[PDB]
Amino acid sequence: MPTLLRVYIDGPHGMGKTTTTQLLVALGSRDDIVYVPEPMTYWRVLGASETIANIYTTQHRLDQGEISAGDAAVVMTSAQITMGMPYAVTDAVLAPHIGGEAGSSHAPPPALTLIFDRHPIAALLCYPAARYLMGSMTPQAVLAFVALIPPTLPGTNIVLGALPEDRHIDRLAKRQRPGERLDLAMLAAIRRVYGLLANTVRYLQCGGSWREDWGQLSGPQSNAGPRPHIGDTLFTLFRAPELLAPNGDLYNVFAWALDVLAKRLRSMHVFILDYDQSPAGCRDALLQLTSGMVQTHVTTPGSIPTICDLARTFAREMGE
Amino acid sequence: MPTLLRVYIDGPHGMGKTTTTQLLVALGSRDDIVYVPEPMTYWRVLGASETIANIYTTQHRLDQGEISAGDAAVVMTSAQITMGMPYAVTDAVLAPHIGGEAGSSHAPPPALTLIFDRHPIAALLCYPAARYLMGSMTPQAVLAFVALIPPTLPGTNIVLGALPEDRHIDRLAKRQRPGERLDLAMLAAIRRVYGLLANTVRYLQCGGSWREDWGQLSGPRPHIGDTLFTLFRAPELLAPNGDLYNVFAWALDVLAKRLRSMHVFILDYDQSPAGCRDALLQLTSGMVQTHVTTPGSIPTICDLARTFAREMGE
Ligand SMILES: Cc1c(C[C@H](CO)CF)n(C)c(=O)[nH]c1=O
Ligand SMILES: Cc1c(C[C@H](CO)CF)n(C)c(=O)[nH]c1=O
């Protein structure tokens, strides 16, 4: 069975994620690598009307006190369902085609390389959590999303981004999505979330156990480094009043959500790309990065062409 | 490895009695059976404040014309998340323990029997689909939920209820839930959804292919018009040329994959509580059992179930 390399390019928007990807795809042959692009069209029309505009407009009004927290929460939750839709369904139809791991460290080239614009967890965790830090969503809702995160397939290579705050602020200020607004508070939140995420993965892969270190709560990089403090991982966010019982402990329903969160991340292959350079540099940087990325076997000989058709149909329809 | 039997008591709400339910609480009394009840406490306090009320009030306000279909959709979509949270979490933590089939039936009794009050497709598929037929949810949000439906593990036995509409109206009016309003339209919609649902599983199990039979919605197994697929011949999901968008067509593929491997059993609710308990006990001799993955799986499950019942149960 021919091998396959799936690479999800995630992280906070506005760092040059797309450009880095497009350039990388432009290097390979026409049909030895395929890009599953950002589904702007689904966010803008197919799924709903201008979802990005709706999201930022809501956060704005909430900040001005024109609407309540409850009002902003119901809108955000719904919008994040629409945002994650293309991500979630692509995975669902992709799963059966994914087999066991093959490996990168000394292993032949993949018959096909799949490059994704973001991973499901982006719309089901990272951004939902960032909105919680903005009082625009509830911890209960976010955890509800976490429990919906699909099982992590073998060889799930996720690439996050690194970029100085100022460089990121300037870069973001220039290029923004249709319907977006310039929110620095949101940028901080989303940046902090992806920082935690990275730590949470390393923490988990170092034998970390949130249940064992939970008491250490009261008052970044993956693939490398020592075991992080739990207060520096995603777990630290859910030390909220709404989730705590009289005895100060988490309700078991939310504790099980954290068990799912850990189960999902502990088997991912997270990498970090330094977006503080020229587009050409980034392309090459990501290129070296992909060398040591876990590949997997497919389940059928006719899986490869199927996935190519899948990726291209996706691009043709939901692509900008 | 020890065997397990999972039974999801589903179907439209309001068909049974409280006595019919307490018998099921008396079933879990023994340690070879556990009864995961409805997470009412999570719906009223934990997840949010009086969720069911917010659902029925929103619909009511939509009908009177105080809010827009867009305003309602947002809330209904949010409310359904809260509703299915306990179901999703339980599945996610339970899944890893579930092994493969164990020559179900014609084989030794289970080491444990797990009875749930509803399956995750109740809050993800059925009720969202009904609210769509109520004009309170968009067909995009529904298929969005469908995409998030957990993979159907082996031994997924689901019991749906049978009951004349007039009889259902009686029992429903006497056992109303906190914040609920008696809506006959919603009763018709939810009944239709579960009707189609049963037709869908048979359709798929008899070799039905929605992409193949899709043309009939515009021009031995049920007709595609009698299955859940018929609802999604909706204008919001179609391109200018009437073609179903691929992203939605993929969501239907997922639906077809989820529903096919399930095992459906119908419980005649038109009788006494004792009669219902017996019938349910009868159906178990045809339900699919499975093995568990670890030795300590059994106690972990039992522990899980009773922690649920004690925390979110009434
Ligand atoms: C994914 C995602 C985003 C980022 C997305 C980048 O392609 C659109 F800019 N954003 C801004 C958001 O507000 N919610 C989301 O779920
Ligand atoms: C599951 C479910 C229901 C039915 C449920 C019965 O146990 C609570 F009454 N209802 C009324 C609802 O409005 N949304 C739902 O997701």
Q: DSSP string covering chain A, please?
A: --EEEEEEE-SSSSSSHHHHHHHHHTTS-TTSEEEE---HHIIIIISSS-HHHHHHHHHHHHHHTSS-HHHHHHHHHHHHHHHHHHHHHHHHHHGGGEEEE--STT-PPPSEEEEEES-THIIIIIHHHHHHTTTSS-HHHHHHHHTTSPP--TT-EEEEEE--HHHHHHHHHHS--TT----HHHHHHHHHHHHHHHHHHHHHHTT--HHHHGGG-----SSSSSPPPGGGSGGGGG--GGGB-TTSSBPHHHHHHHHHHHHHHTT-EEEEEE-SS-HHHHHHHHHHHGGG---EEESSTTHHHHHHHHHHHHHHHH--
The Cα B221–Cα A141 span in angstroms is 40
**CA-CA distances (angstroms) from residue B4 to A172, B7, B135, B213?**
54, 10, 40, 37
Is residue A140 marked as binding?
no
Residues within 6 Å of ligand 2 by CB: B 13, 38, 52, 55, 80, 83, 118, 122-123, 127, 177
Tokens of A140: 């209960």
Residues in chain B, total: 314
> What's the CA gap between B128 and A272, in Å, rounded?
39
* Cα-Cα-Cα-Cα dihedral sign, residues A12, A15, A18, A22: negative
HEC sequence for chain B: CCEEEEEEECCCCCCCCHHHHHHHHHHCCCCCEEEECCCHHHHHHHCCCCHHHHHHHHHHHHHHCCCCHHHHHHHHHHHHHHHHHHHHHHHHHHHHHEEEECCCCCCCCCCEEEEECCCCHHHHHHHHHHHHHCCCCCHHHHHHHHHCCCCCCCCEEEEEEECCHHHHHHHHHHCCCCCCCCCHHHHHHHHHHHHHHHHHHHHHHCCCCHHHHHHHHCCCCCCHHHCHHHHHCCHHHECCCCCECHHHHHHHHHHHHHHHCCEEEEEECCCCHHHHHHHHHHHHHHCCCEEECCCCHHHHHHHHHHHHHHHCCC
Distance between A163 CA and the closest CA of chain B, angstroms: 33
- In one-letter notation, the amino acid at residue A228 is P
Sequence-distant (≥ 6) Cβ neighbours of residue B158 within 8 angstroms: B8, B10, B119, B262, B263, B264, B265
Whichever domain contains A200, its CATH number is 3.40.50.300
Interchain contact B232–A (C-beta under 8 A): no
Locate the ligand 2 atom nearest the alpha carbon of residue B40 and give its number.
8
Which of A80, A178, A183 is closest to A122 using CA atoms? A80
The total of other beta-carbon atoms located within 10 Å of residue B276's CB is 23
* Ligand 1: centre distance to CA B133 (Å): 30
Kindly report the backbone phi and psi dihedral angles of residue A288, in degrees, each rounded to the nearest multiple of 5, phi listed first: -65, -35
Dist. CA A101–CA A297, nearest whole Å: 6
Token representation of residue B98: 């579930």
Which residue, chain included where needed, has tokens 């407009």?
A: A57
d(CA B286, CA B271): 21
Cα torsion B106, B112, B115, B116: sign? negative
Structural domain count, chain B:
1
As beta bridge partners, residue A269 has A157
Size of interface A-B (CB pairs under 8 A): 112
Q: Is the dihedral of CA B126, B130, B131, B133 positive or negative?
A: positive
Q: Which of B147, B129, B149, B153 is nearest to B139 (CA)?
A: B129
Contacts of A60 (CB under 8 A, 6+ apart): A181
**C-alpha separations of B289 from B112, B156, B284 in Å:** 10, 9, 10
Cross-chain residue pair B144–A81, CB shorter than 8 Å:
yes
Q: Which of A141, A252, A314 sits opposite B81 (nearest CB)?
A: A141
Q: Is the dihedral of CA A7, A10, A13, A16 positive or negative?
A: negative
B234: nearest Cα among B219, B223, B249: B249
Q: Do B247 and A46 touch (CB under 8 A)?
A: yes
Q: How was this structure determined?
A: X-ray
Query: Could you tell me the CA-to-CA distances from A273 to A158, B122, B253 in Å, in that order?
Result: 10, 42, 35
For residue A142, the enclosing domain spans 1-320
- Partners of A151 on chain B (C-beta within 8 Å) are 95, 151
**Measured at the alpha carbon of residue B218, what is the angle toward residues B215 and B222, in degrees to the nearest 5?**
65
State how far the alpha carbon of B308 is from the alpha carbons of A243, B51, B301, in Å: 15, 19, 11
Contact B80, B145 (CB under 8 A): yes
The residue among A130, A128, A23 whose CA lies nearest residue A81 is A128
**A145 interaction partners in chain B (CB closer than 8 Å):** 81
The span from the CA of A149 to the CA of A103, in Å, is 25
d(CA A26, CA B16): 62
Mutate to test the interface with A, among B36, B58, B85 (most CBs of A within 10 A): B85
A86 contacts A42 by C-beta, under 8 angstroms: yes
| CB under 8 A, 24+ apart: contacts of B107-112 | B107/B3, B107/B289, B108/B3, B110/B2, B110/B3, B110/B4, B110/B5, B110/B32, B110/B289, B111/B2, B111/B3, B111/B4, B111/B32, B111/B298, B112/B2, B112/B3, B112/B4, B112/B5, B112/B32, B112/B33, B112/B34, B112/B298, B112/B301, B112/B302
A290, A21 contact by CB (below 8 A):
no
- Measure CB to CB from residue B93 to each of A73, A89, A259 and give the nearest one: A259
- B66 an active-site residue? no
